[PDB]
DNA sequence: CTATGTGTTTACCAAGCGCTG
DNA sequence: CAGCGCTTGGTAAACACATAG
């Protein structure tokens, strides 16, 4: 079937309560005035639901949605904007940061004023025209808003940030995915899967799929809490969703170096790992959970790491 | 229908007083001797009123305005100059820094001497850009007037908010507009956007007059401080003060601790904190000042 | 070299094979394509071989490409649209060398199985969505930190290839000898595995060189002594230490007393730039427990004393 | 529009040698050898070429590098007389295919038509972009230097006479003091002061009116605008005058880093007010003294 | 002048011991030799070694350059290469990242891209240091070997062979001196022999005697250690101006009036090899050999 | 005009002896000379040396330039080369990364791809040995370096120029012209033809020493040969930076110059004459500029 | 083939802590 | 207590890559 089952309605959207509270007001005001929405920008870490929110907003407004990509697209964008746009329709550009700095400058006369500067003609007959565009809506989703030019960031009426989820919302997502796929999972098992998900919906769905694989191979029919725990232990995840490599890093830091300041290169060599791989894959979540610190003298293991690994704090 | 409610007169232009005095002197002098105005260049941070000022100047001079763009244009600019330009009219090129380095070489010889050999008429060029550094020095040296747009005081932003409310049909109070002006970041576009969001909140709530209290409620719902700081901007200072002691941190460590891209944390969030004096860029890293400490209700270091 | 085609023929990744077996069995049971899979680890461990073995176990075709081989997004679009089939596998070796624009075309392809391209070349330009078949993407890389995070989050299965023990390298050497007709013994295979640095490719190369040395001498069986003398001729310690590592340890022990020396002082005593001692020689000395990094400096471990035949500290 | 070497305003040191060279060329009845002129933009190199052309007594053919690779042959074989002068502005931008087509016609006189003899005057602002053969094929190399307040005052007086405006010598001198050693800047400032005085309604631009108009423009005695003073103030007061860096300084000034590097910085340098350290930008003691701040 | 047998090769005895083993085993198995990589300083005989290897196997040779190659590597691989033939690529580290990735399919699976079935062949690369090539490249070479600096006796033997092949009479001591002045390099020794022959020919003599060889070598400005006059000047401005302490970057060009160029790449390596310079962490220090060699009284 | 034999060549001793030996031996055994590489600062007369070598060898010349070269190497080595012909190349260090690799096969075994080539003596010329790759440097059998000229050699060169022109410069004045020359023959010739114009306009036929000194002073040259540009550089440094260390980013900007010719054509002479120092943190006036420019020491 | 403009990576270079005898 | 490491941050300068020409 489909492994990227996206909600169609803002009610099926799960856990962006603070964002949804303002989004409902904006959508209601726009629909009451019989006017298209303001240009909208969504940003945040991967896997939180920007691409799903774009489609949910398009369905809520009732308008047609045209989907484009940043890397897909300077002179082309003029043709797409002139030919493929209708009145009140939404144009969605994923990875809008990938637009070249030259291609974004064509959107300046098109987002605030609904016109476009086009030079039409050959040789001495060349002239300039202002091609009027229908009033539309632009939605952009990106992880790097700082790669967008300032005059373009200034033209977005609404800018919103996608925040992390809670274990209960991740459990709700797991339950919805199980119901749509056809797998019977208990609420406690879904909560256990959610607690090991790193506040991300894609991670929760992937973990549920792996647990389903384990249960199906084992011949089970209902993914009970204890069966889910056994499958997660087979996957090698702690109660914080901490893999074996992260636990190895913490153990090496606590034991071999005494938990004190070390540095990236020394710890990487002690772990037989590439320093960049470590600092870009394993370190960020250890920092987020409070199990690691980047002091000016080097990496330090906190008391949370000592209490989680079962060692006596110093 | 229209949200960029551009004024058409220099009297309706709000608050560029220091620039407006010189502009009035230049325009009156040019009109008195029946000669076209000198070539003019406007630059400054986004949202300050360069295009609006260009249109206002065109209206004040009483001549026609031909609007084009830098990205929209070497063999074209010659045709536009030789065919579409009347005598005494204005050619406005927006984002003029994007002009080709060959199309720029075909422009300044026609700007100094009005010959292309086609005898061009007397015309004035207006250029508006955010990056005058991309303009070649030969082209940059032919501009008779070069001006810089400055930020707006909260009272001028309040005047702009009241004008937008009057034109749209919304009823707002002067004290209500003062809060929106204070929370605006010295920019007119930001003030208009904040007024529109407060208007949406008030219309949904059913209120007919946006008093000061209702405006404050809407602004709190938007998540804005008295300094115009969003939640994402307050999180930076909170993480800096609490998780790092306020001392030097660095871009990479701060970005990792905030689950943020370093580039956006450096170019979208930090400039306004630095402008307000709530952040410092020490060579050892980023440091939270005493203003950031007492703004968030923390005891001084 | 001689690549196995069965997961039982694959030699020495047991914790990885335990996870992979249930994934493959469940994917085949549902008659569905496998998830996008990423293999990362140090070179020479068998990532390409594992990709081929996975393709054989699933029973589908395998289209092999490379990171630098895809210069433009048009190549990736053509491969994904024309060269692929439902359930097939596209293996991209060195996937961290893809350009960022080429990595960002893979997001819809891996998640939604669609693709965004622009066609028209001027005033007739337009955007279309190419609908892709349900395929499987396998990526092999040695630098997972060079992969963009949205791309790294789109992999259903992420696995790590670990170093082989001397016994598994001996098993690989014996398999290679049996396939090549040579009659090596258990002890010689164990010695060749110990001389290796936990890598299968190094073990195979050392076996080939020892085979040449034994063949020119007229011997029909590669006895342990012949392997020992051939490996001594190749210039390896009992731990596979080259002469440069030996003399680095000797300079650390004799000249500085084995105590903290520092990177700059040790490098200038060895006439080496501090970008070759740290990245080419230090990691293996630390791996074997012969070198120790301390805030004061670099310290030679007692194991380095016992290995070099020096009096204990 | 000067015609002779006496009408030229303020290149005295160069003019003394140029007069001798032209006199010798006339006495020998032989055309002058090739001449290369260096100098910052805005100093009047093309005007000097015209003056030389008139003084020698021959015609001038003004050309540039990016003016179109085979057109050089048509130029050199279609519009040259005996002893003619051919002027190429921006000679370092000449294409390579054209670059190895001119020096055969410089020394050997052979590249159509056989060129009898002529002289080439080349003007450029970037000597580093001229290859060694091109620099070695020029007989005379000369440098254009910046003007002085008195020479710029003379230029301002000439412009006022051309435009029908009346100025005193003191006002013209004050305008020329604030010019950045350039004639173009002096003319622009004179036009702005003319606008101010005409709007005021004064028949003669006295020194006091010129000073008032230049204060209304926001100019120091050094010619620094408000933005340059703001850059110095931000550098000194907010960063202690120490190294900062282009990005941090641009963020503090709310300015494009490229604009700050290319428009404002070059005049803060060349005046002793700024340095470009590998660790950032440092304000010198001259910046402290100019702004009325205590020494570091 | 190029030899054609490993016996005729002069002085790579340690490398030749293993090369004979690998070569004989490959010949006995009647299969192409594995890919080979040659390290070492320039001028030691890598191309001559490739020619000797090709003649020993009996197969032909297809010498190629590094920066010579994208669309021509496949052409030379398919057309000129029969069953296993040495394709020598000098300066393999200079390949662009366009044909480097096309080598691995041909090196391992012996097919390149339509897809063409390339025949079996052996590739011989050559660089100066292991670090000049990327790690993926230093993985498909079965044999990795290093060339060593020649001793004065081997250089003298090469000079004598060149003299015999040319028709010039030289005493053993003169050739030994010429080899001693050479920096352990065959091309340098051959060049010095040619210069000495040029100097001794105008004198009209028939035998290149040791004294004439020393006079000719002194004419070009070479001491007993083969140092150029620039190296002697550097040593002089080191000792007689600093006493053996750090030289300092500011004062390096004061006595040279030159950019910080060749001093960082042409002078220091040979001085360190000869032991005249030591890179003490405080700074560059001249050893006792520098003091004694420059005609100074012992300390 | 241009010297033909080595005796007519002015100065450049310690290089005309080795060259004499090599050319005599090459004549004796009758085969083309080995490939030669010439080093030295520009203006020392490398092309003249190539012409003298070709004339003494009794063969032709094929002077070309580096950045003029692709199959044009085959064209110029095919029809324009007789056996044992010199093919002097100027600025050989600026060869393209494509045609350079075709020079080696023409240099070892005299075959270029496909027709074979005769034996030819290629002569190169470049400023710095660091600009030419080691594989190319290894291809030249003979490598020599040109040195500067003493004031007497420049004086006699100026005398030869006067003889070819018709001027009667005295020995004591040509000596001063050579002294103010920066050890370069081209600079000496340029100064002589400037003094010629100055004396012609002054109304004189024989140029004594005092007249030459006055003409050189009016041209803008001091006793050390410094022009107005170098003195201006020193003045700007000393005044606007107190003689302190300044890198080649602020000094070039303050002089309205570029980081190009500056430190390439202007400053090397300043360091050579002990007027500038390349400090790790910048550039210093070395306290001799203060004495030369009449300023109090720091 | 060339040229600019942009995004990404990297090599000094300086500062701040902790130890040793 | 004042050299000797180690660790980190930022700043300028290269590289590589794309579009128009
Ligand atoms: N609030 C939500 N409710 C239900 N499913 C969700 C929600 N948010 C995300 N998902 C699902 O999580 C998966 C990933 O969501 P995406 O919207 O693709 O994340 P993303 O923000 O687009 O990540 P990128 O790589 O930055 S585009 C999809 O299968 C979605 O259906
Ligand atoms: N003085 C003013 N009075 C009223 N509205 C103004 C004024 N200045 C600016 N605005 C408004 O500010 C908004 C944006 O400013 P613009 O006039 O478009 O110039 P600009 O924003 O500086 O150009 P860019 O794209 O940001 S570089 C428009 O909606 C204008 O109406
Ligand atoms: N020294 C001068 N004396 C008299 N008139 C001058 C002088 N310099 C310039 N002019 C006048 O300036 C005009 C010529 O402009 P220039 O300054 O020569 O422009 P330019 O030399 O090409 O410099 P750029 O790089 O184009 S700004 C003519 O009207 C000249 O009369
Ligand atoms: N488990 C294994 N069993 C047998 N041979 C192996 C095994 N792992 C690796 N090899 C051999 O080692 C070599 C490793 O190279 P390869 O797997 O192609 O790529 P990588 O070196 O990136 O893993 C292969 O030639 C393969 O034949
Ligand atoms: N052992 C040797 N015996 C004879 N000649 C040698 C020897 N080693 C090197 N040479 C000479 O060196 C020349 C090329 O060697 P070298 O410069 O090392 O190769 P490359 O130029 O490929 O680096 C050959 O002409 C050869 O005559
Ligand atoms: N020693 C010399 N004797 C006579 N003339 C010389 C001498 N050296 C140089 N010249 C003159 O200089 C000219 C060559 O100068 P140039 O080409 O600038 O030097 P280079 O070839 O080193 O760049 C010749 O015309 C020649 O007349
Ligand atoms: Mg994205
Ligand atoms: Mg702009
Ligand atoms: Mg110019
Ligand atoms: Mg791989």
mmCIF file of N, CA, C and O in Angstrom, chain D residues 13 17 20-21 23-24 27-28 33 40 96 100 126-128 131-133 136 139-140 143 145-146 266 269-272 274-276, chain F residues 65 67-68 91 94 186 190 193-194 196-198 200-201 218-219 228-229 240-241 249-250 253-254 256-258 260-261 265-266:
data_model
loop_
_atom_site.group_PDB
_atom_site.id
_atom_site.type_symbol
_atom_site.label_atom_id
_atom_site.label_comp_id
_atom_site.label_asym_id
_atom_site.label_seq_id
_atom_site.Cartn_x
_atom_site.Cartn_y
_atom_site.Cartn_z
ATOM 1 N N UNK D 13 53.144 67.312 -12.592
ATOM 2 C CA UNK D 13 54.347 66.490 -12.693
ATOM 3 C C UNK D 13 54.357 65.682 -13.985
ATOM 4 O O UNK D 13 55.393 65.575 -14.650
ATOM 5 N N UNK D 17 56.875 66.281 -17.982
ATOM 6 C CA UNK D 17 57.549 65.289 -18.813
ATOM 7 C C UNK D 17 56.858 65.132 -20.162
ATOM 8 O O UNK D 17 57.520 64.921 -21.187
ATOM 9 N N UNK D 20 58.007 67.763 -22.660
ATOM 10 C CA UNK D 20 59.331 67.474 -23.203
ATOM 11 C C UNK D 20 59.255 66.366 -24.244
ATOM 12 O O UNK D 20 59.880 66.450 -25.310
ATOM 13 N N UNK D 21 58.491 65.308 -23.955
ATOM 14 C CA UNK D 21 58.383 64.207 -24.910
ATOM 15 C C UNK D 21 57.740 64.669 -26.213
ATOM 16 O O UNK D 21 58.210 64.323 -27.305
ATOM 17 N N UNK D 23 57.663 67.758 -27.407
ATOM 18 C CA UNK D 23 58.582 68.663 -28.088
ATOM 19 C C UNK D 23 59.674 67.892 -28.818
ATOM 20 O O UNK D 23 60.028 68.231 -29.952
ATOM 21 N N UNK D 24 60.220 66.852 -28.183
ATOM 22 C CA UNK D 24 61.236 66.037 -28.844
ATOM 23 C C UNK D 24 60.664 65.316 -30.056
ATOM 24 O O UNK D 24 61.310 65.248 -31.111
ATOM 25 N N UNK D 27 60.335 67.835 -32.794
ATOM 26 C CA UNK D 27 61.633 68.243 -33.320
ATOM 27 C C UNK D 27 62.226 67.174 -34.228
ATOM 28 O O UNK D 27 62.843 67.490 -35.253
ATOM 29 N N UNK D 28 62.054 65.902 -33.870
ATOM 30 C CA UNK D 28 62.557 64.818 -34.702
ATOM 31 C C UNK D 28 61.677 64.536 -35.913
ATOM 32 O O UNK D 28 62.054 63.703 -36.743
ATOM 33 N N UNK D 33 56.373 57.554 -29.353
ATOM 34 C CA UNK D 33 56.262 56.128 -29.101
ATOM 35 C C UNK D 33 55.035 55.830 -28.244
ATOM 36 O O UNK D 33 54.361 56.731 -27.738
ATOM 37 N N UNK D 40 43.730 55.669 -10.860
ATOM 38 C CA UNK D 40 42.398 55.293 -10.396
ATOM 39 C C UNK D 40 41.328 55.902 -11.281
ATOM 40 O O UNK D 40 41.558 56.929 -11.943
ATOM 41 N N UNK D 96 42.308 37.736 -25.418
ATOM 42 C CA UNK D 96 43.602 37.135 -25.730
ATOM 43 C C UNK D 96 43.796 36.983 -27.233
ATOM 44 O O UNK D 96 44.879 37.263 -27.760
ATOM 45 N N UNK D 100 47.220 38.811 -28.653
ATOM 46 C CA UNK D 100 48.312 38.414 -29.547
ATOM 47 C C UNK D 100 47.992 38.728 -31.007
ATOM 48 O O UNK D 100 48.149 37.897 -31.900
ATOM 49 N N UNK D 126 43.915 48.712 -13.677
ATOM 50 C CA UNK D 126 44.413 47.509 -13.015
ATOM 51 C C UNK D 126 45.672 47.049 -13.736
ATOM 52 O O UNK D 126 45.598 46.275 -14.705
ATOM 53 N N UNK D 127 46.851 47.507 -13.309
ATOM 54 C CA UNK D 127 48.092 47.071 -13.966
ATOM 55 C C UNK D 127 48.338 45.575 -13.882
ATOM 56 O O UNK D 127 49.026 45.027 -14.752
ATOM 57 N N UNK D 128 47.802 44.894 -12.865
ATOM 58 C CA UNK D 128 48.068 43.478 -12.691
ATOM 59 C C UNK D 128 47.468 42.593 -13.760
ATOM 60 O O UNK D 128 47.934 41.465 -13.950
ATOM 61 N N UNK D 131 49.536 41.605 -19.248
ATOM 62 C CA UNK D 131 50.594 40.613 -19.348
ATOM 63 C C UNK D 131 51.947 41.287 -19.562
ATOM 64 O O UNK D 131 52.039 42.455 -19.949
ATOM 65 N N UNK D 132 53.007 40.526 -19.292
ATOM 66 C CA UNK D 132 54.358 41.069 -19.416
ATOM 67 C C UNK D 132 54.697 41.565 -20.820
ATOM 68 O O UNK D 132 55.295 42.650 -20.923
ATOM 69 N N UNK D 133 54.396 40.846 -21.912
ATOM 70 C CA UNK D 133 54.705 41.409 -23.241
ATOM 71 C C UNK D 133 54.011 42.731 -23.519
ATOM 72 O O UNK D 133 54.615 43.632 -24.117
ATOM 73 N N UNK D 136 55.811 45.401 -21.673
ATOM 74 C CA UNK D 136 57.141 45.598 -22.232
ATOM 75 C C UNK D 136 57.116 46.184 -23.637
ATOM 76 O O UNK D 136 58.167 46.599 -24.133
ATOM 77 N N UNK D 139 56.546 52.116 -24.874
ATOM 78 C CA UNK D 139 57.753 52.912 -24.710
ATOM 79 C C UNK D 139 57.751 53.752 -23.447
ATOM 80 O O UNK D 139 58.762 53.828 -22.743
ATOM 81 N N UNK D 140 56.626 54.394 -23.142
ATOM 82 C CA UNK D 140 56.520 55.320 -22.020
ATOM 83 C C UNK D 140 55.412 54.841 -21.095
ATOM 84 O O UNK D 140 54.317 54.499 -21.555
ATOM 85 N N UNK D 143 51.906 57.641 -14.684
ATOM 86 C CA UNK D 143 50.919 57.432 -13.634
ATOM 87 C C UNK D 143 50.093 58.695 -13.441
ATOM 88 O O UNK D 143 50.644 59.796 -13.360
ATOM 89 N N UNK D 145 47.839 60.790 -10.905
ATOM 90 C CA UNK D 145 47.705 60.927 -9.463
ATOM 91 C C UNK D 145 46.475 61.755 -9.116
ATOM 92 O O UNK D 145 45.904 62.450 -9.960
ATOM 93 N N UNK D 146 46.075 61.669 -7.851
ATOM 94 C CA UNK D 146 44.890 62.373 -7.382
ATOM 95 C C UNK D 146 45.109 63.880 -7.404
ATOM 96 O O UNK D 146 46.237 64.372 -7.310
ATOM 97 N N UNK D 266 36.954 51.315 0.813
ATOM 98 C CA UNK D 266 38.172 51.802 0.141
ATOM 99 C C UNK D 266 38.552 53.236 0.470
ATOM 100 O O UNK D 266 39.735 53.578 0.369
ATOM 101 N N UNK D 269 40.078 53.215 4.182
ATOM 102 C CA UNK D 269 41.475 52.967 3.848
ATOM 103 C C UNK D 269 41.890 54.096 2.914
ATOM 104 O O UNK D 269 41.036 54.853 2.445
ATOM 105 N N UNK D 270 43.196 54.252 2.675
ATOM 106 C CA UNK D 270 43.738 55.330 1.845
ATOM 107 C C UNK D 270 43.639 56.653 2.599
ATOM 108 O O UNK D 270 44.207 57.668 2.183
ATOM 109 N N UNK D 271 42.966 56.634 3.746
ATOM 110 C CA UNK D 271 42.885 57.783 4.630
ATOM 111 C C UNK D 271 43.462 57.489 6.005
ATOM 112 O O UNK D 271 43.545 58.400 6.836
ATOM 113 N N UNK D 272 43.867 56.248 6.265
ATOM 114 C CA UNK D 272 44.416 55.886 7.554
ATOM 115 C C UNK D 272 43.395 55.650 8.639
ATOM 116 O O UNK D 272 43.759 55.613 9.817
ATOM 117 N N UNK D 274 41.254 52.910 8.657
ATOM 118 C CA UNK D 274 40.848 51.515 8.711
ATOM 119 C C UNK D 274 42.001 50.628 8.265
ATOM 120 O O UNK D 274 42.829 51.027 7.444
ATOM 121 N N UNK D 275 42.039 49.416 8.817
ATOM 122 C CA UNK D 275 42.990 48.389 8.418
ATOM 123 C C UNK D 275 42.244 47.088 8.171
ATOM 124 O O UNK D 275 41.166 46.859 8.722
ATOM 125 N N UNK D 276 42.829 46.234 7.338
ATOM 126 C CA UNK D 276 42.228 44.955 6.972
ATOM 127 C C UNK D 276 43.159 43.849 7.467
ATOM 128 O O UNK D 276 44.019 43.361 6.730
ATOM 129 N N UNK F 65 56.125 32.036 -28.282
ATOM 130 C CA UNK F 65 55.751 32.446 -26.938
ATOM 131 C C UNK F 65 54.944 31.340 -26.277
ATOM 132 O O UNK F 65 54.347 30.492 -26.943
ATOM 133 N N UNK F 67 52.036 31.438 -24.040
ATOM 134 C CA UNK F 67 50.579 31.503 -24.214
ATOM 135 C C UNK F 67 50.141 31.799 -25.648
ATOM 136 O O UNK F 67 49.260 32.623 -25.891
ATOM 137 N N UNK F 68 50.766 31.117 -26.605
ATOM 138 C CA UNK F 68 50.336 31.133 -27.996
ATOM 139 C C UNK F 68 50.027 29.732 -28.498
ATOM 140 O O UNK F 68 49.881 29.531 -29.709
ATOM 141 N N UNK F 91 58.346 32.506 -21.730
ATOM 142 C CA UNK F 91 57.344 32.241 -20.699
ATOM 143 C C UNK F 91 56.795 30.820 -20.834
ATOM 144 O O UNK F 91 55.593 30.594 -20.996
ATOM 145 N N UNK F 94 53.812 29.265 -18.628
ATOM 146 C CA UNK F 94 52.399 29.521 -18.870
ATOM 147 C C UNK F 94 51.829 28.633 -19.970
ATOM 148 O O UNK F 94 50.842 29.007 -20.613
ATOM 149 N N UNK F 186 66.969 46.623 -20.316
ATOM 150 C CA UNK F 186 65.804 47.324 -20.849
ATOM 151 C C UNK F 186 65.595 48.662 -20.150
ATOM 152 O O UNK F 186 65.299 49.673 -20.799
ATOM 153 N N UNK F 190 65.713 52.369 -21.868
ATOM 154 C CA UNK F 190 64.604 53.308 -21.717
ATOM 155 C C UNK F 190 65.083 54.635 -21.142
ATOM 156 O O UNK F 190 64.712 55.711 -21.631
ATOM 157 N N UNK F 193 67.010 56.587 -23.825
ATOM 158 C CA UNK F 193 66.187 57.260 -24.825
ATOM 159 C C UNK F 193 65.298 58.348 -24.230
ATOM 160 O O UNK F 193 64.816 59.202 -24.981
ATOM 161 N N UNK F 194 65.068 58.342 -22.914
ATOM 162 C CA UNK F 194 64.454 59.506 -22.276
ATOM 163 C C UNK F 194 65.433 60.673 -22.180
ATOM 164 O O UNK F 194 65.071 61.825 -22.463
ATOM 165 N N UNK F 196 67.858 61.184 -24.113
ATOM 166 C CA UNK F 196 68.028 61.680 -25.474
ATOM 167 C C UNK F 196 67.010 62.769 -25.791
ATOM 168 O O UNK F 196 67.364 63.834 -26.308
ATOM 169 N N UNK F 197 65.737 62.520 -25.473
ATOM 170 C CA UNK F 197 64.701 63.524 -25.701
ATOM 171 C C UNK F 197 64.940 64.767 -24.856
ATOM 172 O O UNK F 197 64.775 65.898 -25.336
ATOM 173 N N UNK F 198 65.319 64.577 -23.590
ATOM 174 C CA UNK F 198 65.552 65.726 -22.718
ATOM 175 C C UNK F 198 66.696 66.592 -23.235
ATOM 176 O O UNK F 198 66.597 67.824 -23.242
ATOM 177 N N UNK F 200 67.746 66.716 -26.372
ATOM 178 C CA UNK F 200 67.342 67.304 -27.644
ATOM 179 C C UNK F 200 66.506 68.559 -27.428
ATOM 180 O O UNK F 200 66.719 69.582 -28.089
ATOM 181 N N UNK F 201 65.543 68.502 -26.504
ATOM 182 C CA UNK F 201 64.735 69.689 -26.241
ATOM 183 C C UNK F 201 65.553 70.752 -25.515
ATOM 184 O O UNK F 201 65.302 71.953 -25.677
ATOM 185 N N UNK F 218 64.988 65.580 -13.365
ATOM 186 C CA UNK F 218 63.729 66.061 -13.915
ATOM 187 C C UNK F 218 62.805 64.921 -14.316
ATOM 188 O O UNK F 218 61.584 65.108 -14.342
ATOM 189 N N UNK F 219 63.358 63.749 -14.635
ATOM 190 C CA UNK F 219 62.512 62.602 -14.948
ATOM 191 C C UNK F 219 61.838 62.052 -13.696
ATOM 192 O O UNK F 219 60.709 61.557 -13.770
ATOM 193 N N UNK F 228 59.030 57.748 -8.848
ATOM 194 C CA UNK F 228 58.047 58.409 -7.998
ATOM 195 C C UNK F 228 57.104 57.402 -7.348
ATOM 196 O O UNK F 228 56.635 57.629 -6.228
ATOM 197 N N UNK F 229 56.827 56.286 -8.027
ATOM 198 C CA UNK F 229 55.871 55.313 -7.507
ATOM 199 C C UNK F 229 56.377 54.659 -6.224
ATOM 200 O O UNK F 229 55.634 54.541 -5.243
ATOM 201 N N UNK F 240 50.532 56.957 6.694
ATOM 202 C CA UNK F 240 49.212 56.453 7.041
ATOM 203 C C UNK F 240 49.249 55.221 7.937
ATOM 204 O O UNK F 240 48.193 54.818 8.435
ATOM 205 N N UNK F 241 50.417 54.612 8.163
ATOM 206 C CA UNK F 241 50.483 53.445 9.032
ATOM 207 C C UNK F 241 51.641 53.504 10.019
ATOM 208 O O UNK F 241 51.918 52.500 10.687
ATOM 209 N N UNK F 249 46.818 43.721 1.398
ATOM 210 C CA UNK F 249 45.408 43.990 1.150
ATOM 211 C C UNK F 249 45.040 45.424 1.483
ATOM 212 O O UNK F 249 44.220 46.025 0.784
ATOM 213 N N UNK F 250 45.632 45.985 2.535
ATOM 214 C CA UNK F 250 45.434 47.372 2.926
ATOM 215 C C UNK F 250 46.404 48.305 2.211
ATOM 216 O O UNK F 250 46.025 49.415 1.825
ATOM 217 N N UNK F 253 45.151 48.721 -1.383
ATOM 218 C CA UNK F 253 43.949 49.548 -1.420
ATOM 219 C C UNK F 253 44.275 51.013 -1.155
ATOM 220 O O UNK F 253 43.718 51.905 -1.805
ATOM 221 N N UNK F 254 45.174 51.282 -0.206
ATOM 222 C CA UNK F 254 45.527 52.655 0.127
ATOM 223 C C UNK F 254 46.292 53.348 -0.991
ATOM 224 O O UNK F 254 46.285 54.582 -1.057
ATOM 225 N N UNK F 256 45.608 52.746 -4.210
ATOM 226 C CA UNK F 256 44.740 52.593 -5.377
ATOM 227 C C UNK F 256 45.312 51.607 -6.388
ATOM 228 O O UNK F 256 44.977 51.662 -7.576
ATOM 229 N N UNK F 257 46.172 50.704 -5.930
ATOM 230 C CA UNK F 257 46.747 49.651 -6.745
ATOM 231 C C UNK F 257 46.033 48.334 -6.451
ATOM 232 O O UNK F 257 45.012 48.293 -5.757
ATOM 233 N N UNK F 258 46.569 47.247 -6.986
ATOM 234 C CA UNK F 258 46.046 45.906 -6.800
ATOM 235 C C UNK F 258 47.089 45.003 -6.150
ATOM 236 O O UNK F 258 48.282 45.329 -6.130
ATOM 237 N N UNK F 260 48.453 42.694 -7.318
ATOM 238 C CA UNK F 260 49.081 42.060 -8.459
ATOM 239 C C UNK F 260 50.476 42.596 -8.704
ATOM 240 O O UNK F 260 51.439 42.098 -8.112
ATOM 241 N N UNK F 261 50.604 43.575 -9.605
ATOM 242 C CA UNK F 261 51.908 44.177 -9.881
ATOM 243 C C UNK F 261 52.612 44.620 -8.603
ATOM 244 O O UNK F 261 53.835 44.492 -8.487
ATOM 245 N N UNK F 265 56.204 43.883 -9.325
ATOM 246 C CA UNK F 265 57.048 44.767 -10.122
ATOM 247 C C UNK F 265 57.613 45.934 -9.327
ATOM 248 O O UNK F 265 58.565 46.574 -9.797
ATOM 249 N N UNK F 266 57.070 46.242 -8.149
ATOM 250 C CA UNK F 266 57.460 47.431 -7.403
ATOM 251 C C UNK F 266 58.248 47.099 -6.143
ATOM 252 O O UNK F 266 59.352 47.618 -5.946
#
